[PDB]
């Protein structure tokens, strides 16, 4: 849902604008690539898995 | 030559009633513009800020 912003006095005259990150979003392979790779943001795997 | 005056000052007289009829259509064409003015402001705002 590109964020364009209208510059031209002419008409679609614009910037594209792209945000993908969010507090799910973290070492992005392709997405979220299991509890890695935007999960560990997430869920944390320091419980016992780290001992 | 009066018959000429006559039809000559009566076709002033249209000419005069030209002027006003022209002057308020073109009157009334400039206000329409002055509308079309914010309107195309109303364009770059319905540039939606863009997105």
Known sequence: KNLVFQIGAN?????????????????????????????????????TKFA | MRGQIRGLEMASKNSQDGISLIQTAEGALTETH????????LVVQAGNTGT
């Not at chain 1, 008409?11 to 997405?31: C, F, P, R, W, Y």
């Not at chain 1, 790779?37 to 795997?45: E, G, I, R, T």
């Open chain 2, 34 to 41: 002055a509308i079309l003015q914010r309107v195309r402001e």
């Open chain 1, 11 to 47: 008409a679609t005259q614009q910037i594209s604008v792209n945000i993908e990150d969010m507090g799910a979003d973290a070492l992005g392979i392709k997405e979220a690539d299991g509890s890695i790779a935007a999960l560990h943001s997430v869920n944390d795997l320091d419980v």
